[PDB]
């Protein structure tokens, strides 16, 4: 069901949360080799999450589930804010700009924490 596909998508989201927090620790410790690997892992995780969310939104649309579509349009928009900030963080790492990396990292945390009430609403709506 679309609901079970959303729970599968929620787990992937949580996998990225885990890898992100490991990555933050590595950054703070200056283990740049680890950071590079974690950033690659996050890129794959976010790409997978984005795809599952799109399939869920498209299904909710085909089902005529107007409230779920509204919530998923809002949530996917916020997901893209996170994606843009993530990509900027990756660029800051490439460039050696630790000040920008730190900035983008906190911002990505706040965008993600904000979006969690909506994430829980979607589970109930599908």
Ligand X SMILES: O=C(c1ccncc1)c1ccc(F)cc1
Rounded Cα distance, 117 and 62, in Å: 25
Q: How far is the CB of 105 from ligand X (least distance, A)?
A: 11
Contacts of residue 77, Cβ cutoff 8 Å, sequence gap at least 6: none
Q: How many residues does the chain have?
A: 126
Applying CB under 6 A, the site for ligand X has a residue count of 13
Helix axes 2-29, 116-125, angle to 10 degrees: 160
Rounded Cα distance, 106 and 10, in Å: 22
The binder of ligand X chosen from 6, 38, 46, 101 (CB under 6 A): 46
Stretch of residues binding ligand X (CB under 6 A), selected from 28-36, 55-63, 93-101, 112-120: 112-120
Copy the structure tokens of residue 101.
Answer: 């990396």
Nearest to 56 by CA among 33, 31, 75: 75
Stretch of residues binding ligand X (CB under 6 A), selected from 30-38, 62-70, 77-85, 90-98: 77-85
92 binds ligand X (CB under 6 A): no
115 binds ligand X (CB under 6 A): yes
Residue closer to ligand X, measured from CB, 59 or 115: 115
Residue closer to ligand X, measured from CB, 84 or 95: 84
59 binds ligand X (CB under 6 A): no
């Amino acid at each position: 069901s679309v609901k079970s596909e959303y729970a599968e998508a929620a787990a992937v989201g949580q996998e990225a949360v885990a890898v992100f927090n490991t990555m933050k620790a590595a950054f703070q410790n200056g283990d740049k080799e680890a950071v590079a690997q974690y950033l690659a892992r996050l890129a794959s995780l976010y790409t997978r999450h984005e795809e599952l969310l799109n399939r869920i939104l498209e299904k909710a649309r085909r089902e005529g589930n107007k409230e779920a579509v509204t919530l998923m349009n809002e949530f996917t928009a916020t997901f893209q804010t996170g994606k843009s900030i993530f990509n900027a963080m990756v660029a800051a790492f490439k460039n050696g700009d630790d000040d920008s990396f730190e900035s983008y990292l906190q911002a990505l945390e706040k965008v993600t924490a904000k979006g969690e009430t909506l994430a829980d609403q979607i589970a109930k709506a599908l």
